[PDB]
Amino acid sequence: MAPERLRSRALSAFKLRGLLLRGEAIKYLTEALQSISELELEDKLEKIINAVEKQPLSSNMIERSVVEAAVQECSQSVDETIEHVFNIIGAFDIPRFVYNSERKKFLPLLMTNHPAPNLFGTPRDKAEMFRERYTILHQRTHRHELFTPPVIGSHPDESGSKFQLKTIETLLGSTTKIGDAIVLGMITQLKEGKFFLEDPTGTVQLDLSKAQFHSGLYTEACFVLAEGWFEDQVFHVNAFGFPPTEPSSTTRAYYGNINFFGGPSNTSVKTSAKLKQLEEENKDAMFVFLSDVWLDQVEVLEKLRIMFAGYSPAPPTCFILCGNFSSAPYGKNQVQALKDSLKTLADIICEYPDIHQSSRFVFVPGPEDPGFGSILPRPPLAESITNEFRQRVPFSVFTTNPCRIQYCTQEITVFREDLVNKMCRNCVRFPSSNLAIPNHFVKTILSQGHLTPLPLYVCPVYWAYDYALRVYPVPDLLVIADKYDPFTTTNTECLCINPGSFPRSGFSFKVFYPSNKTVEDSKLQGF
Amino acid sequence: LTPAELIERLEQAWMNEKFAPELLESKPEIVECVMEQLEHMEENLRRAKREDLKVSIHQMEMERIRYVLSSYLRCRLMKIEKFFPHVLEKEKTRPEGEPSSLSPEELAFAREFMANTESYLKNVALKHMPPNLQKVDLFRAVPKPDLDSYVFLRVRERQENILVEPDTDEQRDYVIDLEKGSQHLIRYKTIAPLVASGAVQLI
Amino acid sequence: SEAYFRVESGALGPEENFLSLDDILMSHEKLPVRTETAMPRLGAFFNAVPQGSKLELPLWLAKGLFDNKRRILSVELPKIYQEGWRTVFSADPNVVDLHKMGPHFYGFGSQLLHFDSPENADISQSLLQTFIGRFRRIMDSSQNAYNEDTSALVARLDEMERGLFQTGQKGLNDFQCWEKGQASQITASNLVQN
Amino acid sequence: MFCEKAMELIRELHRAPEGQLPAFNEDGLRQVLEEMKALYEQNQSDVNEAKSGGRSDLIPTIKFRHCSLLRNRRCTVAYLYDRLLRIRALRWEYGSVLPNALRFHMAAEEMEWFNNYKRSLATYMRSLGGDEGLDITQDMKPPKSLYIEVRCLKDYGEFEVDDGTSVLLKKNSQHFLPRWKCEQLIRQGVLEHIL
Amino acid sequence: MDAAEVEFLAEKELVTIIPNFSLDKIYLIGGDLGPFNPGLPVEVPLWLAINLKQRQKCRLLPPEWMDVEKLEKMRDHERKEETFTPMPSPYYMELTKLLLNHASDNIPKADEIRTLVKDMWDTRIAKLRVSADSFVRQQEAHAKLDNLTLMEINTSGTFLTQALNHMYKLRTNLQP
Amino acid sequence: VFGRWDETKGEDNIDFMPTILSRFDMIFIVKDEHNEERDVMLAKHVITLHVSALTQTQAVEGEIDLAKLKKFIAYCRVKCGPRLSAEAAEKLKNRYIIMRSGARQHERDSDRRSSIPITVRQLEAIVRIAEALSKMKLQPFATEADVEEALRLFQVSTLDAA
């Protein structure tokens, strides 16, 4: 085709749509379109212009990179992809949204006055953690059926389905011995035995002589609906309860499909037709999850060899190895032992090259593993430890703890901490045994909407990064890796699972199939 | 039709479309002839050499002609976007042989615009409405052109016994004669056939 | 050129424009009525609202409830459209504050004719003569108040007259920019603020 | 009275005559739709009560809620349509790719409508001639000179003039270029026409 | 319609220039021009005349009506008459602006010409003000404005037409 | 009363009656607190200010000229009259009750009436302070943040009455 007419028509095609091409962009475009004639040229131009406009364009002027991506997408090249299909997101990479009350909308921080998060936070940020936790739970609470009736919704007035809400500052006043007060607030043992409630407006004593408590494991720093009456600067509790939990369908139906989970997608990955198709392109799309994988033990390494033997047929897309990787985490000794662990793991992986090229391997280190273990979100394992594994197994990613894994349209959260024991020791009211403890824990986590519903000295967190620990909206998987007990539970279209601790589960572990969201037990105890 | 008179007719249509309240009858012959004239002249100057005075003068005239054509089509598109259900209904109702208010390109644009607007309203709010109220007709919602608007004009072909209708009182009506070259300020509804037939120029 | 233009007000016509923000705000203004038959369940708003009750409710709602048989309610004029204020307008239209006497004076008055009051002709003549009286001052102020504070001039004008004032000011500013040559420059749009 | 929440949408748009686009009032839209839902449920209950029981005094309040519902519909539809008018003006006054500070104000469906409108407009512009169409978005003012002198306001990238010839738009650099090439960048504020 | 567009139409008017360059006949779409011979008068449209004067390629000659005696007679006739008198050009204000702003050096007594044109403009805009006021006061159905120019109509016509639309709807709102 | 504010003598430092003190929206007890860092920086500022009496009266970044500020104040005064938003008024109501209870309990603990009172005038003072803050921005309504800044300023003026 004539280069001058091809250039003129391509420039005109972009110009009529209001787009300007730089010299490199138009040159590359003419080279890419040189093999096409008038039977296809204009349709090709319209298609690639649509591909350009789909991208996050910041200006009418187009660099060569944008048209490169557009024409490559027009030429496919996304067949059997891993990008857009499987992402591991570090906790520091999660977008920092903030809920604005006047707009009643989540805004990204670039659209606000909020500063960037950093470890050495201000005195304000320490309060901002709990203030934002209250804010998210507050906007969650007021959208429940407890909301006031509409305009003459009932001929007699109703008290918000008998669940009308108030804050602490409102009842510090004329409302003495009002028998129907309900307040959202944080439980605190602000004096020993003399518990208090707190919200962003103020504080008040809790007379919890009767608790009448709904199922859930109550601790200090838990936010609760305290139902009771007020007298003598004391809130006399009639009942305690958590705020009701939302499904992600409800949350995204209200706020739209914002990508709260993070990752490359601008929208929530749960709503995408192409990604819905790519999720099911492999009927046995599959992942494996383990924890406390003590590779400083020869026994763990040999049993891992047997597990690779067992999953040579139908290998996963990725193996997920949660942390506390060591029998003996005790410093320099374990730095060298983890180097040896990863050398031996690379040897084993090269002894199964089919699994090496078929599966990825990701690591979520625990609080006891070497490095900045004790404060969350933990950074990844030290790069000097990983370096040989980086070059010998490029099909692997050491990442933060917690980390967010996305597989196509589904949301997986991975977090290593022995939190059930922490929660039950910081318990305010010993729960009823009729519901199992992992169900109590999962209900508490989902209702509190946070991975660490405990005081800061119980769960040390970098203050400005506390949003990364937030469970909101509810994901597809809560992979809470914990010594306590391997388990599987579910609520609000999530499956909340624990792979246990591999040396103490008798070397049992978990398997997950996102194509049908099923979970299977690797019951390989005699392996 | 010599090209000078073609440009003159283009400018006449430009002024009439500026000042008429409704969308006037289309002039596809004028648009196509001016477009091919611009293409031909641009090709000729592409053959000519640079740093040449006559080339620059021809380019300046091309700029003027293209400005008139672009402004005229922009005004027609403004009227189409403003009165899309009414122009589409008029095209639906149009008898055979009666001149169309839309070119084929303008008709396609109007149909696409109406479909886009209806789908937008549906998706945003009108599927959330109660079941009986989910449908609203844009033929009623969008206002019609105001044909009673007052316009200045200058006549080019003499007319007689043009009825001037002051208000609803019929007995206040009278008639006037529009002499050649005279200028008048009058309602558009009393002079719509005249401007359509080219007897008058709106100014 | 292709600048944004609001849906024009159709308040003076036989029926107001559906999509006009000005017409919507105009019709929101309240109108005294007398209810002709008791209405159940509406006692929460003004359980039944009893027969013969005096009410002030929006003009859109009065038009909706009003049937020409006068079955549900009877519609009464606001004070500014009754004979005394019509006489006030007849005295000197230039001094009355139509911004304070309802910002959509002419539009509200024109739609007030829909209820078929016996003094519809008087209302129409009063509106016409008020506009005729105020036209010359509107014209001169709009077309001669160049590059100054127009607050005192535009204060006493209703929204229709304010639109006419802005039209005249726009024409004046356009001609002055032309005469001083500033019209020839190509410039960025108002959206450069962003 | 019922309607006041719908009036806040109307008053929001009426308080900005300059044509700039406010942030989409999603919460207000949700509230007026919820109000319409409640009104419709009450109206259905009352009307079936009246018709089944033969009770005649309900009909005035049935008409009351019916008119209130139609009012709510008129207000929200007018709000959306006027927002569409403001959005449609952006393609001509600024250009195709809106700045992100403004794009953040638009709803997703508003961006859908805007993209459909842009595709329709570009299709219409292409169809005006045999090849390359006519870009009627250009030539917004009558032409005075064939070349103009322009000054770079924004530090900006390379700008092609014709094929191998291009100019670097560094800030405060000043070029003498064709008007039709510089019109879009002047309208976008990258360049300042001088003299 | 903007004043720049009225100027664009005014720029089509023919004026005479004396080139300082040689160029054969050029065949423009609106009509052929030339040949351009050095030192000899040639008639061209006003946009080309102004462009060549800006590029230092010609001397502009004033129109026959840009004469102080003729303009004084026209001004006195305009002030004496009540109706708009026939003007020397249909775009006299725009012609005056362009020619005097770009070629005051060529045109002698440009101050007097500009002041007399301004006098005529003031008188005729005053007449148009009186006509608009009489229209609205007497509730006329139409007016006759034979000798008005396009710039004069464009300066005040948008306001006048909008006001008359409002007046028409006000006086016709009792149609049943 | 004693020249400098003497913290040992407490309310005796004020001789103004409660009736006239109630009429002041805001009361500052601006104490001069000695501190070496503030004193050094203040002295440097003063000396540079005295040196800057010769430098052409140049303007400063992030600042409005006195004449422009004066005209802006006049414009905002004549143009904008704000009001309180409903939820903002609710917040101010609750905070007023807490403040009044604190003042009453302080007076009871001292067994002596405080010199500076806290009354409905102080409530309306907070209201009009919030409205002034809104009028700076030409906003028709005072937000919860405007009321928060008004409360902060009045809390500075109320610590000065503790």
Curated annotation (Swiss-Prot), chain C:
Chief location of this protein within or outside the cell: nucleus
Top-level taxonomic group: Eukaryota
Keyword Nucleus: yes
SUPFAM superfamilies, sorted: GINS helical bundle-like, PriA/YqbF domain
Subcellular localization: Nucleus; Chromosome
Descriptive protein name: DNA replication complex GINS protein PSF3
Biological process terms in GO annotation: cellular senescence; mitotic DNA replication initiation; multicellular organism growth
GO cellular component, one term: CMG complex
Family, as annotated: Belongs to the GINS3/PSF3 family.
Quaternary organization: Component of the GINS complex which is a heterotetramer of GINS1, GINS2, GINS3 and GINS4. Forms a stable subcomplex with GINS2. GINS complex interacts with DNA primase in vitro. Component of the CMG helicase complex, a hexameric ring of related MCM2-7 subunits stabilized by CDC45 and the tetrameric GINS complex.
Xref: PANTHER family: DNA REPLICATION COMPLEX GINS PROTEIN PSF3
Record region (Not essential for folding and stability of GINS complex, but may regulate accessibility to the central complex pore): 1-15
Protein keywords: Chromosome, DNA replication, Nucleus
Function: Required for correct functioning of the GINS complex, a complex that plays an essential role in the initiation of DNA replication, and progression of DNA replication forks. GINS complex is a core component of CDC45-MCM-GINS (CMG) helicase, the molecular machine that unwinds template DNA during replication, and around which the replisome is built.
UniProtKB/Swiss-Prot annotation, chain D:
CDD domains given in the database record: GINS_A_psf1, GINS_B_Psf1
Family matches, as PANTHER family: DNA REPLICATION COMPLEX GINS PROTEIN PSF1, PARTNER OF SLD5
Disease as annotated in the protein's UniProt record: Immunodeficiency 55: An autosomal recessive primary immunodeficiency characterized by chronic neutropenia, natural killer cell deficiency, recurrent viral and bacterial infections, and intrauterine growth retardation. Postnatal growth retardation is present in most patients.
Effect of C152Y: In IMD55; lower GINS1 protein levels and defective DNA replication are observed in patient cells
Family under the similarity heading: Belongs to the GINS1/PSF1 family.
Function recorded in the entry: Required for correct functioning of the GINS complex, a complex that plays an essential role in the initiation of DNA replication, and progression of DNA replication forks. GINS complex is a core component of CDC45-MCM-GINS (CMG) helicase, the molecular machine that unwinds template DNA during replication, and around which the replisome is built.
GO annotation terms (biological process): DNA strand elongation involved in mitotic DNA replication; inner cell mass cell proliferation
Entries under InterPro entries matching the protein: GINS_A, GINS_bundle-like_dom_sf, GINS_Psf1, PSF1_C
Name listed for the protein in its UniProt record: DNA replication complex GINS protein PSF1
Organism of origin: Homo sapiens
Any GO CC annotation of this UniProt entry: nucleoplasm
Signals that turn on the gene: Significantly up-regulated in aggressive melanomas.
Subcellular location: Nucleus; Chromosome
Main location: nucleus
One Pfam family here: Sld5
Assigned keywords, A-Z: Chromosome, Disease variant, DNA replication, Nucleus
From Swiss-Prot, chain E:
Residue(s) carrying N-acetylmethionine: M1
InterPro entries to which the protein is assigned, alphabetical: GINS_A (IPR021151), GINS_bundle-like_dom_sf (IPR036224), GINS_Psf2 (IPR007257), PSF2_N (IPR056784)
Coiled-coil stretches: none
GO BP, sorted A to Z: DNA replication; double-strand break repair via break-induced replication
Cross-referenced Gene3D superfamilies: 1.20.58.1020, 3.40.5.50
Nucleus is among the record's keywords: yes
GO cellular component: CMG complex; GINS complex; nucleoplasm; nucleus
Record key words, sorted: Acetylation, Chromosome, DNA replication, Isopeptide bond, Nucleus, Phosphoprotein, Ubl conjugation
Signal peptide segment: none
CDD domains, A to Z: GINS_A_psf2 (cd11712), GINS_B_Psf2 (cd21694)
Main location: nucleus
Compartment annotation: Nucleus; Chromosome
Record location of the Glycyl lysine isopeptide (Lys-Gly) (interchain with G-Cter in SUMO2) cross-link: K109
The family this protein is said to belong to: Belongs to the GINS2/PSF2 family.
Subunit relationships: Component of the GINS complex which is a heterotetramer of GINS1, GINS2, GINS3 and GINS4. Forms a stable subcomplex with GINS3. GINS complex interacts with DNA primase in vitro. Component of the CMG helicase complex, a hexameric ring of related MCM2-7 subunits stabilized by CDC45 and the tetrameric GINS complex.
Biological role stated in the UniProt entry: Required for correct functioning of the GINS complex, a complex that plays an essential role in the initiation of DNA replication, and progression of DNA replication forks. GINS complex is a core component of CDC45-MCM-GINS (CMG) helicase, the molecular machine that unwinds template DNA during replication, and around which the replisome is built.
Protein name (database record): DNA replication complex GINS protein PSF2
Species whose genome carries this gene: Homo sapiens
Protein's gene: GINS2
UniProtKB/Swiss-Prot annotation, chain F:
The organism of origin for this protein: Homo sapiens
The protein's assembly and partners: Component of the MCM2-7 complex. The complex forms a toroidal hexameric ring with the proposed subunit order MCM2-MCM6-MCM4-MCM7-MCM3-MCM5. Component of the CMG helicase complex, a hexameric ring of related MCM2-7 subunits stabilized by CDC45 and the tetrameric GINS complex. Interacts with ANKRD17. Interacts with MCMBP. Interacts with TONSL; the interaction is direct.
Location of the protein in the cell: Nucleus; Chromosome
Protein task: Acts as a component of the MCM2-7 complex (MCM complex) which is the replicative helicase essential for 'once per cell cycle' DNA replication initiation and elongation in eukaryotic cells. Core component of CDC45-MCM-GINS (CMG) helicase, the molecular machine that unwinds template DNA during replication, and around which the replisome is built.
Sites of Phosphoserine modification: S115
Coiled-coil ranges per UniProt: none
Disease: Meier-Gorlin syndrome 8: A form of Meier-Gorlin syndrome, a syndrome characterized by bilateral microtia, aplasia/hypoplasia of the patellae, and severe intrauterine and postnatal growth retardation with short stature and poor weight gain. Additional clinical findings include anomalies of cranial sutures, microcephaly, apparently low-set and simple ears, microstomia, full lips, highly arched or cleft palate, micrognathia, genitourinary tract anomalies, and various skeletal anomalies.
